[PDB]
C-alpha cells in the first residue's frame, strides 16, 4: 500500500519479478531499494547468459579487461585505496561488548572490533540513504554449501557492483534455484554498496567505484544481517567470503552446536587404499592453498581438495565430525603461485577465472611476483597500476594482496565428495604457523583439551614480529573468543563424539644461517603420512614436553637425506620457557575473565612439563 508512488519498485525491475519473490525477500529487496534509491533492480538468475553479458558490459565501461591468452579469463585493476580487507573498519554489533570480544585485562582487544547498536545506526544513516542513485541494485540469491545440504545456509546479497555479481557466481552457488529452494525459510540479509551514487561527487580512479573514507564492514548476528559500505574488494564486498562464512556463521555455529572455521579440507589416500579427510587452519602466507592442492612426492599417495579456506563442521548422530566446504570457488592470493609451489592451482586458473590487481603481459596473460616462469623475448609487462613494468623495477608488478577467483569444479584434483550434501568425516585437525625458531616440524596434541590449547596458542611471523593468531581466526571471530574456546572444549562432552586427532605443523623452521631446515612443498606428504598412521593408532610417537613427535626412524625420509632431524625436532627449555610466558601473558590479557578453566589447566601443564626438562 501507499498514498503516492514511491514505495512499490515493481516498475524498476529489469530481470525477475518482485511478485515471485518470497515475502521476506521482497521486503528485504524493496525496503533497501526505498533506502538506496537504485535506478533499476536486477534479480540474478545465475545463468551463463547473465554472467557472459555482465562481463561484456563491464569490459565496455572500462571496469574489466579480457585476458586474451586464456579461455574466458578477466582482469580488474582497482583504486589503490581499495585493495584489501580493513580490520579497523570491520565491526560486529551486539547489545553487550562482552558478547563480541572478551574484555581485556590491560590492553586493547585484538580479537575483534565491537560497535554499539547506536553508533552503527548513526554510521548506517550517514552512508546508505540514496547511495545507489543512478545504479542497478543486483539481487544475488546464494547458497553457502551444496544446495539442499543439511549444513548449507542461504543468503541474499544486494549490491550495486557487477564485479561483485560475477565473483559471487564463482565463489557461491547463486541464482534462481536458490530462491526456489529458499521458499519462506530464513536467510542471511547481505547489503553492499560501493558508496558512489551518481552523479559522482568524487573522482573515479581506475574505473573502480569505492568510498575509502566511509568504508565500514558491519555484522549484526542478532539481526542476521551483514551490511558493508565503501569497498568493492574481496572480503569486504563478496559477503559470503568471510562476513557470512566465518563471522556470522561462527555465531550461528555457537548457537546451533557446530563449528565454522578458517580451515582447508583435504582428502588423502594411502598406498593401502585407505582414505582420510583432514582439516587445517593456518595464518596468512603459511601455504594453506598449497597444502589443500598438494602434489605428494611419496609414491602411492594421493591428495584431493574439498576446500582451501572455510570448513563448516558438525558432529552427526553417529559421532563423526562431518565437514562441508561452504564455498563454490577459490579466492586465492596470486603472488607466490607457481608450477613449483602449486601446479594444480596453475591448471585451475587458466579458464573461467577473474583476476584482480595482477600484472598483464602483452600477449594477454597474467604475471606476479613468485610466478617462477620466464617470458619469451618480446613479451612485455603492464603492472597492476597500469604502468609499463620491468623485472628490475623497484615496485612489484602485482599488488601483494592480488587475487585469482576461480571455479572449484576446475581443480584437477577436486575431491569427488567436495559437494556431497552429507559432508566428509574429519579425522585430523592441523594447526600451523611460520616459526623460524624453536617449534618442531610436527607434533601431536596430548588430548582434545591440549589440542584446543594448541589452537589458542598459535603464533606466526608476520618478517621480524611474531604475532598471535589463535585458530587462524583472529580477524574472523563472530563472538567472544573465550566463549569460542568453551564451545570447542564442550565437544568432548557431546554424546558419541569422535574427536579428531589434533596436530601442529611448522614448515618454516630455519638454521642459524636462515636457511629452511625442511624442503616443504610436496615433501609435506611425509608429515601427512605420519599423521595418517597416528590416526590409525600406529605406535610411531615419542612423548615430549610439547606433545608427541615422530619416533626415531618413524618419519619417512627416503629420497631426501641428509635432513637435520635433530635440529628440526629440537626442543629447547629456554625457548619454551619464553614461549609459555608469551602465551600466558596473551591469554591473560586478551581472554581474561572468559578464559576457560581447561585452557588455564593446559597452560599450567605445559609450564610444568617444560620446568622438568
Ligand atoms: Mn582465508
Ligand atoms: Mn571438559
Ligand atoms: Na579498473
From Swiss-Prot:
Keywords: Acetylation, Cytoplasm, Decarboxylase, Endoplasmic reticulum, Gluconeogenesis, GTP-binding, Kinase, Lyase, Manganese, Metal-binding, Nucleotide-binding, Phosphoprotein, Transferase, Ubl conjugation. Mn(2+) binds at residues 242, 262, 309. Cytosolic phosphoenolpyruvate carboxykinase that catalyzes the reversible decarboxylation and phosphorylation of oxaloacetate (OAA) and acts as the rate-limiting enzyme in gluconeogenesis. Regulates cataplerosis and anaplerosis, the processes that control the levels of metabolic intermediates in the citric acid cycle. At low glucose levels, it catalyzes the cataplerotic conversion of oxaloacetate to phosphoenolpyruvate (PEP), the rate-limiting step in the metabolic pathway that produces glucose from lactate and other precursors derived from the citric acid cycle. Phosphoenolpyruvate carboxykinase activity is regulated by acetylation and glucose levels. The anaplerotic conversion of phosphoenolpyruvate to oxaloacetate is improved by PCK1 acetylation on Lys-89 (K91ac), Lys-464 (K473ac) and Lys-512 (K521ac). High glucose concentrations favor PCK1 anaplerotic activity by triggering acetylation on Lys-89 (K91ac). At low glucose levels, SIRT1-mediated deacetylation of Lys-89 promotes the cataplerotic conversion of oxaloacetate to phosphoenolpyruvate. Phosphoenolpyruvate carboxykinase activity is inhibited by 3-mercaptopicolinate. Changing residue 89 to Q: 3-fold decrease of affinity for phosphoenolpyruvate. It catalyses: oxaloacetate + GTP = phosphoenolpyruvate + GDP + CO2; L-seryl-[protein] + GTP = O-phospho-L-seryl-[protein] + GDP + H(+). It comes from Rattus norvegicus. The modification N6-acetyllysine is found at residues 68-69, 89, 464, 512, 515, 585. Substrate binds at residues 85, 233-235, 284, 401-403. The modification Phosphoserine is found at residues 17, 88, 116, 284. Disulfide bonds: none annotated. Monomer. The gene is Pck1. The modification Phosphothreonine is found at residue 176. This is Phosphoenolpyruvate carboxykinase, cytosolic [GTP]. It is found in: Cytoplasm, Cytosol; Endoplasmic reticulum. Residues 455-478 are annotated as: Omega-loop. Its cofactor is Mn(2+).
Amino acid at each position: 500500500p501507499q498514498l503516492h508512488n514511491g514505495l512499490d519498485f515493481s516498475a524498476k525491475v529489469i530481470q525477475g519479478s518482485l511478485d515471485s519473490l518470497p515475502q521476506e525477500v521482497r521486503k528485504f529487496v524493496e525496503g533497501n531499494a526505498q533506502l538506496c534509491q537504485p535506478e533499476y533492480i536486477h534479480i540474478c538468475d545465475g545463468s551463463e547468459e547473465e554472467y557472459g553479458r555482465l562481463l561484456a558490459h563491464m569490459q565496455e565501461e572500462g571496469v574489466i579487461r579480457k585476458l586474451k591468452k586464456y579461455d574466458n579469463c578477466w582482469l580488474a585493476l582497482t583504486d589503490p585505496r581499495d585493495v584489501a580487507r580493513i580490520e579497523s573498519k570491520t565491526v560486529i554489533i551486539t547489545q553487550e561488548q562482552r558478547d563480541t570480544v572478551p574484555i581485556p585485562k590491560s590492553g586493547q582487544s585484538q580479537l575483534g572490533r565491537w560497535m554499539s547498536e547506536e553508533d552503527f545506526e548513526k554510521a548506517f544513516n550517514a552512508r546508505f540513504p540514496g547511495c545507489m542513485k543512478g545504479r542497478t541494485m543486483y539481487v544475488i540469491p546464494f547458497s553457502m554449501g551444496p544446495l539442499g545440504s543439511p549444513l548449507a545456509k542461504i543468503g541474499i546479497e544486494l549490491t550495486d557492483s557487477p564485479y561483485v555479481v560475477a565473483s559471487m557466481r564463482i565463489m557461491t552457488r547463486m541464482g534462481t534455484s536458490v530462491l526456489e529452494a529458499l521458499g519462506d525459510g530464513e536467510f542471511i540479509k547481505c547489503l553492499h554498496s560501493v558508496g558512489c551514487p551518481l552523479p559522482l561527487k568524487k573522482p573515479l580512479v581506475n574505473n573502480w567505484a569505492c568510498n575509502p573514507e566511509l568504508t565500514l564492514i558491519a555484522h549484526l548476528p542478532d539481526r542476521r544481517e551483514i551490511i558493508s559500505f565503501g569497498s568493492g574488494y574481496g572480503g569486504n564486498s563478496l559477503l559470503g567470503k568471510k562476513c557470512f562464512a566465518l563471522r556470522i556463521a561462527s555465531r550461528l555455529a555457537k548457537e546451533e552446536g557446530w563449528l565454522a572455521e578458517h580451515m582447508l579440507i583435504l582428502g588423502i589416500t594411502n598406498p593401502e587404499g585407505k582414505k582420510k579427510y583432514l582439516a587445517a587452519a593456518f595464518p596468512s602466507a603459511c601455504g594453506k592453498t598449497n597444502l589443500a592442492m598438494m602434489n605428494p612426492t611419496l609414491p602411492g599417495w594421493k591428495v584431493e581438495c574439498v576446500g582451501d579456506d572455510i570448513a563448516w563442521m558438525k558432529f552427526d548422530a553417529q559421532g563423526n565430525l562431518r565437514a562441508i566446504n561452504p564455498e563454490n570457488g577459490f579466492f586465492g592470493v596470486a603472488p607466490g603461485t607457481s608450477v613449483k609451489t602449486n601446479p594444480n592451482a596453475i591448471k585451475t586458473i587458466q579458464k573461467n577465472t577473474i583476476f584482480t590487481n595482477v600484472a598483464e603481459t602483452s600477449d594477454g596473460g597474467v604475471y606476479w611476483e613468485g610466478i617462477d616462469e620466464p617470458l619469451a623475448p618480446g613479451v612485455t609487462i603492464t603492472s597492476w597500476k597500469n604502468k609499463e613494468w620491468r623485472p628490475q623495477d623497484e615496485e612489484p608488478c602485482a599488488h601483494p594482496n592480488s587475487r585469482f577467483c576461480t571455479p572449484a569444479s576446475q581443480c584437477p584434483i577436486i575431491d569427488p565428495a567436495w559437494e556431497s550434501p552429507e559432508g566428509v568425516p574429519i579425522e585430523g585437525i592441523i594447526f600451523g604457523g611460520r616459526r623460524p625458531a624453536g617449534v618442531p616440524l610436527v607434533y601431536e596434541a596430548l588430548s582434545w583439551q591440549h589440542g584446543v590449547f594448541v589452537g589458542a596458542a598459535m603464533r606466526s611471523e608476520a618478517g621480524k614480529v611474531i604475532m598471535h593468531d589463535p585458530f587462524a581466526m583472529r580477524p574472523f571471530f563472530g563472538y567472544n573468543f573465550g566463549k569460542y574456546l568453551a564451545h570447542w572444549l564442550s565437544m568432548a562432552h557431546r554424546p558419541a563424539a569422535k574427536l579428531p586427532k589434533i596436530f601442529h605443523v611448522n614448515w618454516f623452521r630455519k638454521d642459524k644461517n636462515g636457511k629452511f631446515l625442511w624442503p616443504g612443498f610436496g615433501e609435506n606428504s611425509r608429515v601427512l603420512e605420519w599423521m595418517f598412521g597416528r590416526i590409525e593408532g600406529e605406535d610411531s610417537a615419542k612423548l615430549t614436553p610439547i606433545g608427541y613427535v615422530p619416533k626415531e626412524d618413524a618419519l619417512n625420509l627416503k629420497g631426501l637425506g641428509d635432513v637435520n632431524v635433530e635440529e628440526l625436532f629440537g626442543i629447547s627449555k629456554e625457548f619454551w620457557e619464553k614461549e609459555v610466558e608469551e602465551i600466558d601473558k596473551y591469554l591473560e590479557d586478551q581472554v581474561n575473565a572468559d578464559l576457560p578453566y581447561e585452557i588455564e589447566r593446559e597452560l599450567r601443564a605445559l609450564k610444568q612439563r617444560i620446568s622438568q626438562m
